[PDB]
Design an enzyme around this catalytic site. Structure first.
Site, PDB file in Angstrom:
ATOM      1  N   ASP A  33       0.715  -1.220   0.000  1.00 11.67           N
ATOM      2  CA  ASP A  33       0.000   0.000   0.000  1.00 11.67           C
ATOM      3  C   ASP A  33       0.754   1.287   0.000  1.00 11.67           C
ATOM      4  O   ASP A  33       1.087   1.788   1.090  1.00 11.67           O
ATOM      5  CB  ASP A  33      -1.034   0.041   1.168  1.00 11.67           C
ATOM      6  CG  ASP A  33      -2.009   1.184   0.880  1.00 11.67           C
ATOM      7  OD1 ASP A  33      -2.125   1.518  -0.304  1.00 11.67           O
ATOM      8  OD2 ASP A  33      -2.621   1.744   1.795  1.00 11.67           O
ATOM      9  N   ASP A 217      -0.850   5.158  -6.167  1.00 14.40           N
ATOM     10  CA  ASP A 217      -1.344   4.185  -5.191  1.00 14.40           C
ATOM     11  C   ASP A 217      -1.099   2.756  -5.568  1.00 14.40           C
ATOM     12  O   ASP A 217      -1.873   2.192  -6.347  1.00 14.40           O
ATOM     13  CB  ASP A 217      -2.876   4.397  -5.022  1.00 14.40           C
ATOM     14  CG  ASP A 217      -3.265   4.113  -3.575  1.00 14.40           C
ATOM     15  OD1 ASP A 217      -2.533   3.347  -2.940  1.00 14.40           O
ATOM     16  OD2 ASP A 217      -4.273   4.626  -3.075  1.00 14.40           O
TER      17      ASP A 217
END
Length: 331
Positions: A33, A217
């Site tokens: 992440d 991301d």
């Protein structure tokens, strides 16, 4: 030194690797992440009424001897889901490296989306400023250890089968990329965010007039932007809206125009093959695109999110010494 963690690809929307927590180590499947900074896994104290905790692997601190208490409550707020639990300490092993890390034992996991997840938890590769509870991020600790060959890490996402992908801490793997890397400096620090000087729909640079932000991301399955932005965008490819998805007749999928992203002067283009899920060519059936509309509130947003869809085409290197992002063709 250089260490790499191999990922698994589950239908191009979930890429997870494996880390071990404890002693003896308790294995967990996780997503790495770049949008968050905390590390979490479900915990034994998670009530079995949360169906998610019945379907995932749980962390037992009673079965780990390196485990140190900490009560500290945690509420991580992702943009798609939320989880809650408390701080814990133990030794995590990430692809060879061993680091003493403070993670969160989640005790609250909503079935949507957690029930859709093939992985158990998450590892944030973000800065310590988006770090909820100021708890030092795992990359920062590995850095502190002084073992890597470079204060960086890269991502490689593959396009299924029928190897998934791979993260390399300390550098890049020239087998998954070609040509030269090209860097873009972070606008602000403490966030893997860069400026975008417009998105081009075919031959009209119909999106990004005046300039916008772009969050890279690795923990996002799709490319996403503002409802409005995305709204004009779909209008242009000519797509019809579903619950919280967008679509096109498989027939015409392969006919859509190229979408181009202007980053650092260079422009990263995506073909209609890179963003349309071609599970057929019928006229009776509809195909889902890999671009979602999602309004991301400040201070972070509003922002575009380059996730899954984008990282598959461009190998990504997260420079942490020079605070910039470098993209290069994937292989």
């Amino acid at each position: 030194t250089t260490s790499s963690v191999i990922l698994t690809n589950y239908m191009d929307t979930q890429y997870y690797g494996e880390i071990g927590i404890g002693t003896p180590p308790q294995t967990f499947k996780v997503v790495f992440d770049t949008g968050s900074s905390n590390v979490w896994v479900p915990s034994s104290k998670c009530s079995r009424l949360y169906t998610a905790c019945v379907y995932h692997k749980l962390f037992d601190a009673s079965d780990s001897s390196s485990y140190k208490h900490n009560g500290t409550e945690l509420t991580l707020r992702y943009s798609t889901g939320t989880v809650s639990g408390f701080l814990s300490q133990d030794i995590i092993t990430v692809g060879g490296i061993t680091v003493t890390q403070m993670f969160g034992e989640v005790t609250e996991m909503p079935a949507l989306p957690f029930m859709l997840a093939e992985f158990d938890g998450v590892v944030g590769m973000g800065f310590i400023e988006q770090a909820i509870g100021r708890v030092t991020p795992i990359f920062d600790n590995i850095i502190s250890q002084g073992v890597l060959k470079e204060d960086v890490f890269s991502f490689y996402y593959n396009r299924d089968s029928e190897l998934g992908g791979q993260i390399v801490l300390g550098g890049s793997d020239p087998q998954h990329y070609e040509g030269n890397f090209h860097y873009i400096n972070l606008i602000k620090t403490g966030v893997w965010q860069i400026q975008m000087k417009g998105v081009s729909v075919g031959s009209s640079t119909l999106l990004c007039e005046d300039g916008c932000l772009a969050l890279v991301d690795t923990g996002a399955s799709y490319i996403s932007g503002s409802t409005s932005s995305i709204e004009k965008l779909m209008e242009a490819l000519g797509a019809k809206k579903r619950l919280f998805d967008y679509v096109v007749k498989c027939n015409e999928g392969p006919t859509l125009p190229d979408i181009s992203f202007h980053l650092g002067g260079k422009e990263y283009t995506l073909t209609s093959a890179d963003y349309v899920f071609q599970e057929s060519y019928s006229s009776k059936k509809l195909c889902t695109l890999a671009i979602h509309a999602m309004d991301i509130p400040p201070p972070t947003g509003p922002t575009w999110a380059l996730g899954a869809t984008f990282i598959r085409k461009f190998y990504t290197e997260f420079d942490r010494r020079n605070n910039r992002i470098g993209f290069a063709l994937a292989r």
